[PDB]
Paper text:
Here we focus on the prokaryotic Argonaute [name] from [name] DSM4304. Although phylogenetically classified as a long-B pAgo, [name] contains only MID and catalytically inactive PIWI domains, akin to short pAgos. We show that [name] forms a heterodimeric complex with a protein encoded upstream in the same operon, which is a structural equivalent of the N-L1-L2 domains of long pAgos. This complex, structurally equivalent to a long PAZ-less pAgo, outperforms standalone [name] in guide RNA-mediated target DNA binding.
Comparison of this 172 aa ORF to a homologous sequence found in a nearly identical [name]-encoding genetic island present in the genome of a related strain [name] DSM88774 revealed that it contains a premature STOP codon due to a 2 bp deletion. To study the structure and function of the full-length upstream protein, the restored full-length open reading frame, with the missing TA nucleotides inserted, was cloned into an E. coli expression vector and the corrected protein was subsequently purified by liquid chromatography. We were able to solve its structure by X-ray crystallography in two symmetry groups: P1 (resolution 1.85 Å) and P3221 (resolution 1.4 Å). Two full-length upstream protein chains found in the asymmetric unit of the P1 structure, and a single chain found in the asymmetric unit of the P3221 structure overlap with an RMSD of 0.85 Å (determined using PDBe Fold). We henceforth refer to the full-length upstream protein as [name]-N. The upstream protein ([name]-N) is the structural equivalent of the N-L1-L2 domains of long pAgo proteins.
Author numbering: 20 to 242
The structure:
C-alpha cells in the first residue's frame, strides 16, 4: 500500500463563470484572474456582471481551475499559518513554537508548498511538500548551516540539524533513527495541512462563487 503526497479534490464546480479581456502590458497578476495566451480570464470573486460559463469538458476549465483552487485555498488559511506566496504555487508558513535548544537565536518555520496536479481530464489534487526554513532570529533572514557554524559555532549547527530532523519526524524527538519514520512523516504532513486550512475532520468543503470545493485530507493510495 503506497501513499503519495497528493490530496484529492473530490468535489468541485462542474461549471465556472469566467470573463475574458485582452491581455495588456500593464497587467499585474493577482487573485481571481489568469493570463492565458493573449487573454486574461477573470473568475471567482473577479467576475463582474458580464460572464460566460465553462465546464470541465473544456480545456480552458483546467487551466483556470488549477489557479482558482489555490486562490480559494488562500482565503481559508487558519492561524497560525501565513501566506508566503500565491501564484502558480501556494506557499504557507508557520513558526515552530515548540521548545528546542538554541530557539532563542535560531527560528524554525514549517513551509507547506502546495501545487495543483491535474490528470485524466477531470481529476484534480493538491501536491503538498513540507520544508523547514531555518532563520537567524535576530534578523529573521534565512541562515545556512555553514553560517550557523561560523556565527554561533559547531555545536549549535549540529544541534539545529538534529532538531530540524526531529521536527520533520526524520528522527525521534531524542534524535535517533526509528523504524516507522515514513508513516509518521506522512501523518505530520497530513496533520499540518489540516491545521493550515482549519480542518478537524479528514475532509473539508470550501465555498466558492460557483459552488463547493471538497478536499479529502488523506493521501492518495496506490495499492
Ligand atoms: C470578496 As473576497 C472573499 O475575495 O475578499
Ligand atoms: Cl497570470
Ligand atoms: Na460539484
Amino acid at each position: 500500500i503506497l501513499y503519495i503526497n497528493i490530496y484529492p479534490i473530490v468535489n468541485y464546480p462542474e461549471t465556472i463563470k469566467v470573463s475574458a479581456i485582452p491581455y495588456y502590458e500593464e497587467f499585474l497578476p493577482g487573485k481571481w484572474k489568469k493570463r492565458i495566451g493573449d487573454l486574461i480570464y477573470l473568475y471567482g470573486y473577479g467576475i463582474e456582471n458580464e460572464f460566460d460559463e465553462i465546464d470541465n469538458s473544456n480545456a480552458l476549465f483546467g487551466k483556470i481551475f488549477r489557479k482558482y483552487l489555490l486562490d480559494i485555498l488562500s482565503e481559508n488559511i487558519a492561524t497560525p499559518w501565513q501566506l508566503k506566496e500565491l501564484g502558480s504555487t501556494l506557499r504557507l508558513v508557520k513558526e515552530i513554537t515548540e521548545n528546542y535548544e538554541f530557539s532563542n537565536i535560531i527560528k524554525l518555520q514549517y513551509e507547506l508548498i502546495i501545487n495543483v496536479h491535474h490528470w485524466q481530464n477531470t481529476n484534480f489534487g493538491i501536491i503538498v511538500d513540507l520544508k523547514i526554513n531555518i532563520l537567524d532570529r535576530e534578523n529573521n533572514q534565512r541562515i545556512s548551516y555553514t553560517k550557523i557554524k561560523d556565527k554561533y559555532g559547531e555545536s549549535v549547527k549540529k544541534k539545529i540539524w538534529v532538531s530540524v530532523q526531529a521536527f520533520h519526524r526524520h528522527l525521534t524527538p531524542e534524535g535517533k533513527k526509528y523504524a516507522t519514520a515514513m508513516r509518521d512523516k506522512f501523518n505530520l504532513l497530513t496533520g499540518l495541512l489540516k491545521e493550515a486550512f482549519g480542518s478537524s475532520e479528514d475532509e473539508k468543503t470550501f465555498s466558492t462563487p460557483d459552488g463547493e470545493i471538497k478536499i479529502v485530507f488523506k493521501p492518495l493510495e496506490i495499492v
